[PDB]
């Protein structure tokens, strides 16, 4: 409703006072300990009753926090922490009561976003959309017809669930409106957008499983399933490096700058070690004991015992690691977002020991130089979230996974035993993440954190993630109430959406040009159609059987 | 230090106190151009202290000098030097008026032998690297086991395909940035101009070669003419979409995007001529001179007949507002700038009109020498006719192909005859000069001559490679049929793959030609592997 961009209010500060130097300091909720930034300097009024005015636009994702504290006395004069609206026109008047006081009015009423569209406009566009789609559809044939007139199967609950996290990370990679909760969490907590990716490793961990055993039954040897695992992996890794990680509109590649790590990097290198551990280890898959009602054998742990003594050690050495290491003009065992995080006294320590890690071994020009962090707790330095100490936590998500793929196909025929192992690693892992981070977004022991991948993060993520396989191995397979209807299509042809989407970013159907480019509904209605459109993509090349496999 | 790629600092003296120096510089190759002001030099200060001035002056081909004075307006001296690249030219004139134009260094000259003896042992050194990184696959595993269409595609057609497709992405690229690897600016022959015009022949070649199996194995027509409405709908929106708009600059536009495109013109092509053979199709027959392909072809030959006149009365005859009817010259400084902005006449205009400015090619091929303001696009609505019939002439050698398959003279002598005839109706044309003659050979109106020339040097490279690589089978096209069968693949994916490493990475001077070149070889050479894995692989896309 006027220069105001993107979740920005407009607060207008009348500073009546007569004889004080008054400044304006702002901070954000979602920040744990961080510095109280300068937002604006109101100078005192040149005569009572002629308040002097400045304009300052204050954040409205989440919160502000405001203190108001003389310039030159050092003294507060008072605080506030109100939630600005989007677009509102709100007014700060401080004068004196008789000490002195700040009176906070709302001249204009906000757009209040995700107020209005809430759920209403969201059915409305959907129902849109999909009018429209099927009245293309059934218009395509009447040219046609103008013419004419004239003269071991792929399990489907892990194809769903992985349709399910491609959809939502193509939906948040694309933006998802610029909400800031289908965005990123800054440093700590769970947003949406931090949700596919764990799942991405999870259900590859389950995936592993499910081909390695199906392989090795259908009579191929070890040191063949060995080359493939290793060929798959080390093309991960250049795929990722070469096509998703560089932005290449900026300029061609130099090694100067070239960003190592990355999401295909961490993918193919957890999957190398998870695929060659289950390879080492791999035995073959028994027979039930003919009950398949409430059997309470464990052989699936005992039968993968070296694995996870061989998890354990690594999360061992994740713990002592980013616990236990110094890292120089850093506290030891740093798990704070740096910056202005934890009162801005370690502001170049973004990440802590794992940040020293990515530094040491990869140098600084090749790490994520723009981490989620940036944003809010203005971080200098330059943080990879998929880093190599991040790397064990993702290996051993990837082995949660594999024993989920475990669970569900050693009681095949045992569908009571398969859902009572899904609901008794949900509580686990549940109460794992629960105890680590004790329900807080930045207390606890270890935090919920994406960018560290941190061991709760791994925890609450595999918890979500055997949920929801409990939640869709029944509908999906054994009830069959639902086939996953417009999901398991991006879950057979994962990797070509996931290349797709990193390639044809910006590309017509998937991005055009806004009217309103400072406008959630516009970015929302845009990112939504270019998930649908990916979706459809992706159900045409179900239909015609092109499945892109690595 | 301060000079770019392709030019030379130009430095000049002058020895006179009474009449300040202005220089203006034109390019030779430049049929009619303005002498655009390089530098200003003022009168000496005093003797013995001439005024020195320094400028660069662009060494591709040519640089003719007029010095004249800025007060008097009369010229001095004259020279046409061709200068070298990164030189260091010094043209001192004095009172005896003459110009005497010392070189003090000798030009580097990038397109000297140094872009053919330095090409080829970097092609050496590729082919020897990637054997030796071939070699080392098996032999190393081994070691450590111890320590534990009805009838087959012609490939000549393939090859011509494959060949294009090698020159295309070779000068897309940039081709070292050399100017003989661009297109030509307005009027002219390049090696980049003579890509486009063999594809639309072996598009019309392989129309011919599609349909006539389709027709005869198990197929009608009236799907047949779906497949081809529905190959030209895909091309169509492919071209418009994926390749050419550049999306580094920001989400589409419908206010900025270009309508017409490489793809966009071989899909409307396509369905023009894969329709016409589709409504006059005949079976093939099983003679020195039969010429049963064009009896059995002549309402085709009728139609595009009648196309050619269209697009030759609307070239020479269609009222352009501001500006000479039959008007096929480049505008900007060209034709001695008597037309600003006239960049392509009569095409141009049709362009303008129905299409809009703002839906054209924004940068067009005369920008960079003829200074043209307009927008012209050299896929635009009247050279599609040029392009139907150049597709066209590409259909009657797959009629040749496959009328006399038994008889391989019977194809070698008709290959000679249009080669010929072709040929001759070139020269006649453009009376062997560039820039002279009824229709000059020109890319960016399609110009008919430009349609014949380029059909003929179709026709020798097919009277070439059919006899080589099928009858007697002397050279199967061993790096050219791999892209030859995944042409659309490999088009498709340069045009989205420009900026990737393999293909692009950064450079250690920007200005320099054996870098530019070096890069654009290497990544020719990695699409040439592509599409050769591919072909192992049998993954071949089509539509
Ligand atoms: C890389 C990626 C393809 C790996 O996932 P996957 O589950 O291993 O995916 P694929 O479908 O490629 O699986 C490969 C093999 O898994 C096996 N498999 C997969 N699902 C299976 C199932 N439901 N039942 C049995 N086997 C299965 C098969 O053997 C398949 O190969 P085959 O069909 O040739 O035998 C996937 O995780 C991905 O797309 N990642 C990028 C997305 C990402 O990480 N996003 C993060 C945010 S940017
Ligand atoms: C592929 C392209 C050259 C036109 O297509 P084509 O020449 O017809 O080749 P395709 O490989 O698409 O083949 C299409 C048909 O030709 C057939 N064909 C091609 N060569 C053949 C041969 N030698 N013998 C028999 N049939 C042949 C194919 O089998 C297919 O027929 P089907 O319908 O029976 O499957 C075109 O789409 C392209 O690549 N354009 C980009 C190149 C360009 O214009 N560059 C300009 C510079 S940017
Ligand atoms: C705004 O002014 C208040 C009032 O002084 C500051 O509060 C104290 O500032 C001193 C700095 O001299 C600190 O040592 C104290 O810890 C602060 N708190 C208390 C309770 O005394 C406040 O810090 C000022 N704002 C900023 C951003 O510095
Ligand atoms: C769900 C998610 O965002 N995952 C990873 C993330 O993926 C992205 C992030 C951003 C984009 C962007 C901005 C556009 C796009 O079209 O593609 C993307 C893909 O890239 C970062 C590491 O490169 C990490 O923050 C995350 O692990
Ligand atoms: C030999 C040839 O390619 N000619 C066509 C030409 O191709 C190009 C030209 C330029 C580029 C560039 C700049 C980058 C790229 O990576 O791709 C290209 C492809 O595009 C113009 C119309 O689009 C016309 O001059 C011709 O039709
Ligand atoms: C407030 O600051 C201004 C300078 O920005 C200064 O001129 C003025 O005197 C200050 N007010 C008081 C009361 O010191
Ligand atoms: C906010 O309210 C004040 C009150 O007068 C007004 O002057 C100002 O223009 C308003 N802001 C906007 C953006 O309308
Ligand atoms: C050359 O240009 C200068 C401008 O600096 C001018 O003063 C001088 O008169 C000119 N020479 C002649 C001969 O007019
Ligand atoms: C330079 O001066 C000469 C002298 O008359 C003139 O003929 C020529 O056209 C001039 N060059 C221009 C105007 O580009
Ligand atoms: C060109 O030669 C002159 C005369 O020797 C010299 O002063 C000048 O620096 C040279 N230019 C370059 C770029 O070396």
Known sequence: HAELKMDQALLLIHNELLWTNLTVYWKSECCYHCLFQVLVNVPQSP???????????????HGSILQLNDTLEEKEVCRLEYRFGEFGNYSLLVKNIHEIACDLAVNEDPVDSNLPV??????????????????????????????????????????????????????????????????????????????????????????????????????????????????????????????????????????????????????????????????????????????????????????????????????????????????????????????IGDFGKYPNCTGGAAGYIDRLLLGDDHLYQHPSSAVLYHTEVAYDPEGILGTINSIVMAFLGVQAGKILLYYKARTKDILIRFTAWCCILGL???????????????????????????????????????????????????????????GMNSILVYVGHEVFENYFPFQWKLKDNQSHKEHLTQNIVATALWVLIAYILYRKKIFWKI
Not at 153 to 162: A, E, G, H, I, K
Not at 298 to 306: A, G
Not at 447 to 472: C, H, M, Q, R
């Open 47 to 61: 005569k009572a009753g002629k308040p002097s005015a400045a304009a300052a636009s204050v954040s409205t994702q």
């Open 118 to 339: 809430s759920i209403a406009f969201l059915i409305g566009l959907a129902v849109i959309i999909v009018i429209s789609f099927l009245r293309l559809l059934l218009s395509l044939d009447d040219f046609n017809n103008w013419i004419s007139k004239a003269i071991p199967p792929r399990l489907r609950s892990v194809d769903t669930f992985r349709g399910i996290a491609l959809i939502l990370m193509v939906f948040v990679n694309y933006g998802g409106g610029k909400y800031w909760y289908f965005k990123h969490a800054s440093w700590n907590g769970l947003t949406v957008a931090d949700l596919v990716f764990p799942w991405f490793v999870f259900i590859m961990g389950s995936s592993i499983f499910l081909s390695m055993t199906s392989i090795l039954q259908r009579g191929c040897s070890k040191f063949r399933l060995l080359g493939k695992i290793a060929w798959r992996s080390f093309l991960l890794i250049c795929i990722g490096i070469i096509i998703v990680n560089p932005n290449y509109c900026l300029g061609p590649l130099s090694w100067d700058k070239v960003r190592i790590p990355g999401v295909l990097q961490r993918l193919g290198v957890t999957y190398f070690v998870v695929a060659v551990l289950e390879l080492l280890f791999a035995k073959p898959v028994p027979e039930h004991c003919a009950s398949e009602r409430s059997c309470l054998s464990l052989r699936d742990i005992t039968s993968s015992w070296p694995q996870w003594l061989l998890i354990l050690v690594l999360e061992g050495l994740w713990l002592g690691l980013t616990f236990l290491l110094p890292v120089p003009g850093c506290p030891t065992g740093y798990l704070g977002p740096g910056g």
């Open 432 to 490: 794992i993440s629960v105890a680590l981070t004790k329900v807080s977004e930045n207390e606890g022991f270890i935090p919920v954190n994406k960018n560290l991948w941190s061991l709760s993060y791994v925890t609450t993520l595999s918890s979500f993630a055997f949920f929801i396989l409990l939640v869709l191995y029944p509908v999906v397979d054994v009830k069959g109430l639902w086939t996953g209807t417009p999901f398991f299509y991006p």
